[PDB]
Write an enzyme that holds these catalytic residues in place. Structure first.
Site, PDB file in Angstrom:
ATOM      1  N   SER A 181      -0.246  15.465 -12.278  1.00  0.00           N
ATOM      2  CA  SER A 181      -0.446  15.085 -13.679  1.00  0.00           C
ATOM      3  C   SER A 181      -0.661  16.337 -14.541  1.00  0.00           C
ATOM      4  CB  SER A 181      -1.628  14.123 -13.813  1.00  0.00           C
ATOM      5  OG  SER A 181      -1.965  13.840 -15.129  1.00  0.00           O
TER       6      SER A 181
ATOM      7  N   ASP B 170       0.853  -1.209   0.000  1.00  0.00           N
ATOM      8  CA  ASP B 170       0.000   0.000   0.000  1.00  0.00           C
ATOM      9  C   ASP B 170       0.882   1.250   0.000  1.00  0.00           C
ATOM     10  OD1 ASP B 170      -2.013   1.869   0.236  1.00  0.00           O
ATOM     11  OD2 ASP B 170      -2.419   1.421   2.358  1.00  0.00           O
TER      12      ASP B 170
HETATM   13  N1  WQY Z   1      -3.991   3.393   0.319  1.00  0.00           N
HETATM   14  C1  WQY Z   1      -4.301   3.987   1.620  1.00  0.00           C
HETATM   15  C2  WQY Z   1      -5.214   5.204   1.551  1.00  0.00           C
HETATM   16  C3  WQY Z   1      -6.646   5.012   1.688  1.00  0.00           C
HETATM   17  N2  WQY Z   1      -7.518   5.992   1.643  1.00  0.00           N
HETATM   18  C4  WQY Z   1      -7.148   7.307   1.459  1.00  0.00           C
HETATM   19  C5  WQY Z   1      -8.073   8.384   1.404  1.00  0.00           C
HETATM   20  C6  WQY Z   1      -7.707   9.664   1.241  1.00  0.00           C
HETATM   21  C7  WQY Z   1      -6.327   9.955   1.103  1.00  0.00           C
HETATM   22  C8  WQY Z   1      -5.442   8.963   1.148  1.00  0.00           C
HETATM   23  C9  WQY Z   1      -5.738   7.619   1.309  1.00  0.00           C
HETATM   24  C10 WQY Z   1      -4.849   6.500   1.364  1.00  0.00           C
HETATM   25  N1  WQY Z   2      -6.601   1.837   0.866  1.00  0.00           N
HETATM   26  C1  WQY Z   2      -6.037   0.722   1.697  1.00  0.00           C
HETATM   27  C2  WQY Z   2      -6.995  -0.304   1.990  1.00  0.00           C
HETATM   28  C3  WQY Z   2      -8.183   0.050   2.754  1.00  0.00           C
HETATM   29  N2  WQY Z   2      -9.143  -0.809   3.069  1.00  0.00           N
HETATM   30  C4  WQY Z   2      -9.103  -2.139   2.745  1.00  0.00           C
HETATM   31  C5  WQY Z   2     -10.143  -3.095   3.096  1.00  0.00           C
HETATM   32  C6  WQY Z   2     -10.092  -4.414   2.759  1.00  0.00           C
HETATM   33  C7  WQY Z   2      -8.947  -4.855   2.003  1.00  0.00           C
HETATM   34  C8  WQY Z   2      -7.970  -3.984   1.676  1.00  0.00           C
HETATM   35  C9  WQY Z   2      -7.944  -2.615   1.981  1.00  0.00           C
HETATM   36  C10 WQY Z   2      -6.952  -1.615   1.660  1.00  0.00           C
END
Ligand code: WQY
Ligand code: WQY
Length: 330
Positions: A199, A35
């Site tokens: 971008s 992530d």
């Molecule tokens: N991949 C983790 C993640 C999940 N949700 C978000 C929502 C807003 C900003 C950054 C975020 C980052």
């Molecule tokens: N944006 C990161 C993130 C957030 N929530 C999750 C829920 C279930 C599986 C993976 C997930 C990954």
């Protein structure tokens, strides 16, 4: 040093990608969601509330001869999708694709939200955003990449996500066989803890390119492409019968449609997302309404270049003293 590990979609829609990670001595292999939008390495464990485990592989620190309780440390995280987890902390040996870090903070979940319990395929997350977002208290901890950086041949990792197919995460080197043409690098702001970049614009299908700055984050842990409402309306206006559904929670389209491509700018370069990448299938089993892979970022407060966008490119996360992002076609 370097490491190289295969990443595999969890389902037929590429809803997320899992990468095997060795934790402890002897190794316990867990499949983690890498992530670049968060900074905690957390796992389902022998400490997780039993009713909240449904098929995941668990880390058992008592079975690792190298595990040490990090005394007094706790963690608690919420994600943009409303999911959450929390627990306590061990240090242990963590290896990804042959690259080993000793003394990595491994955040052991005591609690996970319903969405994590309900997904048997994801044993935890491995965060690859900046360590300033790590949630460990009272002593913030470093990401796997931050701990490995100084040992790596080059202070970089790369994401090469597949469309309905496996891909690769590499640490410490750029595989010049894995992309076409050249890598275009672009500036990063670390002010919000993310791989945040701008971008240079977009095109819809064979349409003319619109030059416009779009600030957003490169996030492997988000499934979809979230962009400003103006851009998203322009895309779905090219799909007969597409509409924004408040009841479903975004743009839907007739499953019988052929979707147009979407192009985004990286400097003077262009990354083309094929139309098929934007189809996330029936909204419910057997429906002829399909869920779109490009959605509005209105109310999220940031644009998110998630897997729909990143899987169309070879992406370089350059952790030099001044970080940058690189994008290539492939
Ligand atoms: N991949 C983790 C993640 C999940 N949700 C978000 C929502 C807003 C900003 C950054 C975020 C980052
Ligand atoms: N944006 C990161 C993130 C957030 N929530 C999750 C829920 C279930 C599986 C993976 C997930 C990954």
């Amino acid at each position: 040093s370097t490491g190289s590990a295969t990443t595999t979609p969890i389902d037929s829609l590429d809803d997320a990608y899992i990468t095997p990670v060795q934790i402890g001595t002897p190794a316990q292999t867990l499949n983690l969601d890498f992530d670049t939008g968060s900074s905690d390495l957390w796992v389902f464990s022998s400490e997780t509330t039993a009713s909240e485990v449904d098929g995941q592989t668990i880390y058992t620190p008592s079975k690792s001869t190298t595990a040490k309780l990090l005394s007094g440390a706790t963690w608690s995280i919420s994600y943009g999708d409303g999911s959450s987890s929390s627990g306590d902390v061990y240090t242990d040996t963590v290896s990804v694709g042959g690259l080993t870090v000793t003394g990595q903070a491994v955040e052991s979940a005591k609690k996970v939200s319903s969405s994590f319990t309900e997904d048997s395929t994801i044993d935890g997350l491995l965060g690859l955003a900046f360590s300033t977002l790590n949630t460990v208290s009272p002593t913030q901890q470093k990401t796997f990449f931050d701990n490995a950086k100084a040992s790596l041949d080059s202070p970089v990792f790369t994401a090469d996500l597949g469309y309905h197919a496996p891909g690769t995460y590499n640490f410490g080197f750029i595989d010049t066989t894995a992309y076409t043409g050249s890598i275009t690098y672009t500036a990063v702001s670390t002010k919000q803890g993310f791989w945040e970049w701008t971008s240079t614009g977009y095109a819809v299908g064979s349409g003319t390119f619109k030059s416009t700055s779009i600030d957003g984050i490169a996030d492997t842990g988000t499934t979809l492409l979230y962009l400003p409402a103006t851009v998203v309306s322009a895309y779905w206006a090219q799909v007969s019968g597409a509409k924004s559904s408040s009841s479903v929670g975004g743009y839907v389209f007739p499953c019988s449609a052929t979707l147009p491509s979407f192009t985004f700018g990286v400097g003077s370069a262009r990354i083309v997302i094929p139309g098929d990448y934007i189809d996330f299938g029936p909204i419910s089993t057997g429906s002829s309404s399909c869920f779109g892979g490009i959605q509005s970022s209105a109310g999220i407060g940031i644009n998110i270049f998630g897997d729909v966008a990143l899987k169309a490119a070879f992406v370089v996360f350059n952790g030099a003293t001044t970080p940058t992002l690189g994008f290539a076609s492939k």
